[PDB]
Design an enzyme around this catalytic site. Structure first.
Site, PDB file in Angstrom:
ATOM      1  N   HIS A  47     -21.415  26.596  -8.256  1.00 46.25           N
ATOM      2  CA  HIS A  47     -20.157  26.100  -8.803  1.00 46.25           C
ATOM      3  C   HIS A  47     -19.095  27.127  -8.455  1.00 46.25           C
ATOM      4  CE1 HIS A  47     -22.825  23.974 -11.972  1.00 46.25           C
ATOM      5  NE2 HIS A  47     -22.619  23.184 -10.935  1.00 46.25           N
ATOM      6  N   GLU A  66     -21.694  14.267  -5.179  1.00 42.07           N
ATOM      7  CA  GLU A  66     -22.861  14.016  -6.020  1.00 42.07           C
ATOM      8  C   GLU A  66     -22.671  12.941  -7.084  1.00 42.07           C
ATOM      9  OE1 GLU A  66     -23.712  17.222  -8.839  1.00 42.07           O
ATOM     10  OE2 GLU A  66     -22.179  18.339  -7.730  1.00 42.07           O
ATOM     11  N   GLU A 116     -26.922  13.950  -3.666  1.00 40.51           N
ATOM     12  CA  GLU A 116     -25.933  14.986  -3.439  1.00 40.51           C
ATOM     13  C   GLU A 116     -26.042  15.641  -2.069  1.00 40.51           C
ATOM     14  OE1 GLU A 116     -26.363  18.290  -6.137  1.00 40.51           O
ATOM     15  OE2 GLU A 116     -24.332  18.991  -5.625  1.00 40.51           O
ATOM     16  N   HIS A 175     -17.821  19.614  -6.733  1.00 43.69           N
ATOM     17  CA  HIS A 175     -17.351  20.946  -7.061  1.00 43.69           C
ATOM     18  C   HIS A 175     -17.329  21.790  -5.802  1.00 43.69           C
ATOM     19  CE1 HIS A 175     -21.476  22.559  -6.907  1.00 43.69           C
ATOM     20  NE2 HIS A 175     -21.839  21.534  -7.659  1.00 43.69           N
ATOM     21  N   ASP A 197     -32.991  18.379  -7.881  1.00 43.61           N
ATOM     22  CA  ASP A 197     -31.773  19.139  -7.631  1.00 43.61           C
ATOM     23  C   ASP A 197     -32.159  20.606  -7.392  1.00 43.61           C
ATOM     24  OD1 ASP A 197     -29.130  20.176  -7.486  1.00 43.61           O
ATOM     25  OD2 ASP A 197     -28.525  19.062  -9.288  1.00 43.61           O
ATOM     26  N   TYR A 214     -27.086   7.484 -14.782  1.00 43.56           N
ATOM     27  CA  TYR A 214     -28.113   7.884 -15.753  1.00 43.56           C
ATOM     28  C   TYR A 214     -28.101   6.905 -16.892  1.00 43.56           C
ATOM     29  CZ  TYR A 214     -26.629  11.840 -12.987  1.00 43.56           C
ATOM     30  OH  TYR A 214     -26.219  12.645 -11.951  1.00 43.56           O
ATOM     31  N   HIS A 267     -29.323  18.903 -16.412  1.00 46.90           N
ATOM     32  CA  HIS A 267     -29.913  20.187 -16.006  1.00 46.90           C
ATOM     33  C   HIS A 267     -31.295  20.377 -16.629  1.00 46.90           C
ATOM     34  CE1 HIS A 267     -25.426  21.282 -15.516  1.00 46.90           C
ATOM     35  NE2 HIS A 267     -25.903  20.937 -14.335  1.00 46.90           N
ATOM     36  N   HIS A 275     -20.304  13.182 -15.346  1.00 46.31           N
ATOM     37  CA  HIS A 275     -19.925  14.447 -14.730  1.00 46.31           C
ATOM     38  C   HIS A 275     -19.033  14.168 -13.539  1.00 46.31           C
ATOM     39  CE1 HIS A 275     -22.929  13.958 -11.426  1.00 46.31           C
ATOM     40  NE2 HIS A 275     -23.790  13.594 -12.363  1.00 46.31           N
ATOM     41  N   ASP A 313     -27.109  23.235  -1.979  1.00 40.77           N
ATOM     42  CA  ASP A 313     -27.101  22.453  -3.212  1.00 40.77           C
ATOM     43  C   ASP A 313     -27.314  20.979  -2.886  1.00 40.77           C
ATOM     44  OD1 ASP A 313     -26.672  21.188  -5.629  1.00 40.77           O
ATOM     45  OD2 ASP A 313     -24.692  22.041  -5.972  1.00 40.77           O
TER      46      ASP A 313
HETATM   47 NA    NA Z   1     -23.958  20.217  -7.526  1.00 38.25          NA
END
Ligand code: NA
Ligand SMILES: [Mg+2]
Ligand SMILES: [Mg+2]
Ligand SMILES: [Mg+2]
Ligand SMILES: [Mg+2]
Ligand code: NA
Ligand code: NA
Ligand code: NA
Lengths: 440, 440, 440, 440
Positions: free
Chosen positions: D361, D383, D406, D354, D260, D387, D243, D350, D271
């Site tokens: 979310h 998504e 995503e 979702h 994003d 990383y 984030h 992650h 999203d």
């Molecule tokens: Na998302």
């Protein structure tokens, strides 16, 4: 004895004297306190609020405003008069009678405090407030200050400085006036009469709480309705618990009983401890411990005077205790070494003295380790004790013995006055008293 | 008399019986309560917590978990044992002794409640909690439920349903068991003995608080250390104030004195009022009012039984009162009209009866206007009174008279049992009692 | 332009200079703020905390300690470094890098503030704290002070004096330094470029929010990511609503559009309003109102200088407004009388000027009725407007017209510098700009 | 697309259908939220309150009362109309217009809620309330329930059962209606257009925040004023922070940029994440990682359908990831063993998916490990990402690469519909798009 109108006035002025110009002091009454469901405990006023007013109602606020060095005035917020509420719950002073009765300049209804308090604080530089004392008081005070902060367009300004008045007020309370000493003298007499009576009534087979009943009845008959603290009647091993208040056991022949009890008279606390044989005759083992505690008290009573400290007298008591305990074989070794190792602490684990006044454990700064130099007008307790646990590794005969002997004194110009010496503490005088009573 | 281990067990099971499956009930102990500064009032347990435990410590929580219709268990949170804290402030049950002592399955330290409670509530559908009762309890319960709500990734779920158990528990408390009645019977005896003594000790020139002292001493000697409520000794015009607790006046020859006092014995309240002449002889004017109050009580004692209500018996009392007051010229007009206009209300402005138990004003639903049909096992007071204000516009001789006479009863299968009839209330019996005492 | 390390240092020292010896100032960071469920709004630092640090993290506290007139030091509490939390939510300064980065003497973990803050306040006489600013800050500060108050046996003492630093700090913020003026100059340029663009893009049939989009894109491209306040695009009657932010209507040929928008650049607010024809040509009726607003601004821009006040310049604006409105027949009567009756207020119902800085409505004392004498370094807005309600009883052609024109100025030694004059406001220049854009 | 009056009505009825008879549901509006001093963030309604109303004001409460299985009615509390407050801060619905506008039976002023709410709850058995959601709501609800609890003499009774409606309401929100899907389809299109534009505008030397500006402008022009969450533009190593919202760095030739971003359109969230070369040409190393992420997405898009779960599709993604990473020498060992050891977690830390709706979310139960069986009408994200930390011990060419791709899908009867496929994700299509834009 009582506290005069004039005395409450002097105290208010003595506080105002120390306040900055352009300031207000806010002193709030205690809340009512629930005992269970809709029943409440007997009301006990905040000691600091009482100190400036002698006013025994809730929902009251004393506001002392110092405009400058020669100009100040007082505003009281208190409950309005109300026929229905008073038919039910009892009479109220109200606003009309309060100025004359309590010597304030102005009295307003407590129901209007949120509409009025900010107006009183507007434009001042300083507010004296005991922040954290009561949540209801903090809500009221913060609410007022926010109105002022946010009201610049209505030409309102909040005092930016808030000062805790408790250090100042507790410093005042530390030094008793002649009137206060006269009231505390009577509290000591009343409390002494109660302790004498408990000794005279004690018989094996009575319960600890029975002596509590005798003590409370005696307080009440001299006009001290309530104790200053919950009464302790610790017989046998219960005497080794410092604040034993269960008072639930049958008192047994052969045991000692430790009584710690004090009346509240005109707001002021008596505070006496006497320990004595349930059957009126100390055993050898009991005498051996008792004499060490008694010598400690008697020596402390000699020593206390202006210029010494609680710390200094405590060192003398520790020496007496360590020496006596070594002679009995309860401690072993060199006295000075044992003293240096604080070897008395398993047996004497509290302080010798605390301040006494409107609270039994009274306000006022002690200094580091209670080293503050004593001066005339300070009032304190003198309460050595020895508590030998049921399972202490010491000779069997000393196990489960708790003895405390406590007197209340005022420091004078040349020494101290003992306020509680009208109840006996020498063992032979105790025994005589109990024998005489048994005839019863 | 006492409440057995088995009885506390039955009560817990009687509550669990009514709970949904997949639920927990949370019952919290009362907080300790400050009297002044660092001194606290004698501890009084929450009545509902006491009801399920007989446990007299703070920082305790009873958790009753119902898995299903045949599976339930109990967890207690209570204070850990601690040598230093107990040497000081007295003994603690602790975790080891609690299962056996209090008949719970498991006991945990109260210091761990935030780490443990959510684990106990996890996966349940319902939590029974008395929301708003105590702020500390609400913090603990809300904190647990938030942990569960926010912990879905740790596979935690909160019960979505919260139910107030007070209606259920207060409904249980409304119906006394044989053991409870035996305890309340002894409370009534103890309280009656105290009232008899106050009548026997009363002399002109004594203060109101002196009779309070006598009463409290008598409570204490039978093992009821505390009153169930603050004692009322209203002599003269003070008798017109319903909860006069100042008890500060000299009792004067010629005046009546109204005593409202009750002991607390094993948690249960006695509650008696007697009114009597300070000098042991009722005047004509005093008799005239007293007889109306006495007839009201005696008639109510006859009438109370299963199938009537407080409302229904109250209507009979109003008739008696209005008729008696008309005959004295205190009221004027037609009785039925005066009754219809509630013309007794300036003189009798409270209820005839309240529930009595672990609280003096006990829990339990009354119904609209106290119309609930009475059944066996209900316990209540019967307390007619007449209070004529000092400035009532009535014949001079009745002004400033307050009279209440109050007995405690249990509803039986065929009527009621009077628990407080061992203290006299007929005026000639009062006068004889006082004469006999004055000889012693 | 930016604020230097050295400047933040000077500000901290300028505050310490005014603090009492034996004191600490506590400045807390803004909390993170929920937008919905688990999503948060873009973080905005507390303006006062930012002012002393330029540090854009939550959970941070600057503590400035003044031992005496030549000795002071700084402690920062901030978030610890944490690999997992940073992989997720972004990089953290931490404790190691903070002394050098932010020029503080010491940095501690915010997680330890309850264990460390009371130690920093121990023995001080004064604490500077903005009480009521944030509830989390008050909890932390009150908790520390209570530890000290109650810790006399551990030789702890609380400062008895708490002072609000906001008056002092806001007084500092009222006077911009050269660096601050350079930053605000760039904010004004950026904001002016955005307003020019909105005029150039406007076409009938576009929505109000489209001009908002243009404005925000222009802010962003010069490095001002966020507006200083929610953008107002009020076309037609929407221009009569002072903080219209719905921006939801189709812009119609024939209507005016009022744009109030400002960027936030290095913490500092731009703040411009321009009103213009949606179709690029003012009507006669629109010109008639616009010219009164324009003359008011232009006259105010001439007048503003050291030694006058917002109040004084406002009186000149009222005269211009009342005169212009009388000439149009919107007001009727004698100008001086109408002025005396505040007859402009239905049409101009807000202030002419507010302070501008780190907040759009900036801190600093205005004086009664904004009468404070202006001095060099003060920064303010100049924003006359006329708003004629859709249903005002005035000639039809003026109803539903809202016009505001707003520039940002800094008071200089000889007058003022206009920071926002790079966007046009003379009607003929507006029309030329829009014509040129429509070609392209 | 929008949500109809009829749809809000259906949702209210669908909730009432599940409520007990003799109950009320209380749904509260979001508070206004401070950005700094007196400026507030753009208002965002509570998602659950919005869901039942489409009403975008604060200080509002929807009360749904179910008398029985065929009788229910709605009461709204909302802000009163107020000429002064609206001239300033914008128009209000008020009480008169609300019944028709929002389809409620009755509307009352929010200023009267404390005088009215308890009257609405009186005599009910159950109250549905989201306890802990908002402190202002809890104060209002607890205050009402206490009035009822304590008001038995005024014949008031509180519902003893409180139920959290969030589980029920979030379960409803989990299944989108055709209207909701149409709104989310448009959100996906709008969001896709924004991502396409960012790819087309990207040039080396631009800052991360510039692409944010492009994206927000594109949202705004289609009528989605605000993002659903704070936009992430992570170029280079910033792409390894999940984030990253600082968006402060110069975008460098040779680096990837991860975007994003999602619009909020009629309350509903788009999203999307796209990752692409800043210079429009993926390197071999970048392709190697990108293809693994792309295969994961494309495979997941094939697999998602009724009867599978997020958990089940995630296992397939883990296999693809572990296999691809082993082939590149980023992981070493046996694939099935590495899978069993969760050896992908340093690189993909992650969840894959979702819920998506009124919150990005979104609400709704996932089941243990997100094992809940998928059904038609569920909306979710897909998504996958990889990383590789700047200091990962892997071949140099992969270090500091962050890639996420995503898409948003709705589960249909036979599979899923991709709502975000109108923005390209195949690398050759990305490169073509950027080349075409650079010509242009
Ligand atoms: Na998302
Ligand atoms: Mg022994
Ligand atoms: Mg008389
Ligand atoms: Mg027009
Ligand atoms: Mg590289
Ligand atoms: Na003592
Ligand atoms: Na009673
Ligand atoms: Na402005």
């Amino acid at each position: 004895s009582e506290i005069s109108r004039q005395e409450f006035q002097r105290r208010r002025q003595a506080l105002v004297e120390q306040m900055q110009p352009g300031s207000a002091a806010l002193i709030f009454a205690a809340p009512e306190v629930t005992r269970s469901a809709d029943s409440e405990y007997p009301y006990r006023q905040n000691s600091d609020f009482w100190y400036f007013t002698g006013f025994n109602e809730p929902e009251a606020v004393l506001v002392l405003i110092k405009s400058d060095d020669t100009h100040n005035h007082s505003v009281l917020f208190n409950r309005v008069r109300d026929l229905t509420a008073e038919i039910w719950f009892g009479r109220r002073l109200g606003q009309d009678a309060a100025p004359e009765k309590l010597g304030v300049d102005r009295a307003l209804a407590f129901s209007e405090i949120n509409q009025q308090l900010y107006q009183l604080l507007n434009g001042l530089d300083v507010v004296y407030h005991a922040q954290g004392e009561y949540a209801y008081a903090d809500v009221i005070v913060n609410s007022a200050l926010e109105k002022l902060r946010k009201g610049s367009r209505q030409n309102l300004t909040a005092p930016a400085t808030m000062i805790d008045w408790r250090p100042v007020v507790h410093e005042m309370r530390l030094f008793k006036s002649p009137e206060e000493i006269a009231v505390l003298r009577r509290a000591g007499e009343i409390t002494a009469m109660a302790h004498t009576r408990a000794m005279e009534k004690c018989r094996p087979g009575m319960f600890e709480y029975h002596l509590e009943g005798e003590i409370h009845h005696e307080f009440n008959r001299h006009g001290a309705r309530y104790p200053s603290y919950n009464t302790i009647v610790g017989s046998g091993e219960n005497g080794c618990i410092l604040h034993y208040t269960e008072n639930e056991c049958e008192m047994r022949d052969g045991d000692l009983v430790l009584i710690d009890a004090g009346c509240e008279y005109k707001g002021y606390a008596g505070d006496i401890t006497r320990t004595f044989p349930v059957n009126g005759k100390f055993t050898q083992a009991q005498r051996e411990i008792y004499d060490i505690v008694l010598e400690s008290l008697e020596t402390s009573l000699r020593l206390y005077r202006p210029g010494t400290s609680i710390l200094e007298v405590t060192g003398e008591v520790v020496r007496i205790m360590v020496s006596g305990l070594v002679k009995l074989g309860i401690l072993k070794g060199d006295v000075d070494e044992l003293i240096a190792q604080n070897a008395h602490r398993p047996f004497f684990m509290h302080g010798l003295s605390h301040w006494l006044g409107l609270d039994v454990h009274d306000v006022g700064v002690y200094g580091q380790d209670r080293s503050r130099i004593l001066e005339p007008g300070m009032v304190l307790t003198v309460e050595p004790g020895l508590y030998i646990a049921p399972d202490a590794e010491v000779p069997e005969q000393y196990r489960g013995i708790g003895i405390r002997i406590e007197d209340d004194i005022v420091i004078t110009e040349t020494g101290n006055e003992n306020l509680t010496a009208s109840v006996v503490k020498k063992p032979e005088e105790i025994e005589a008293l109990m024998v005489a009573a048994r005839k019863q």
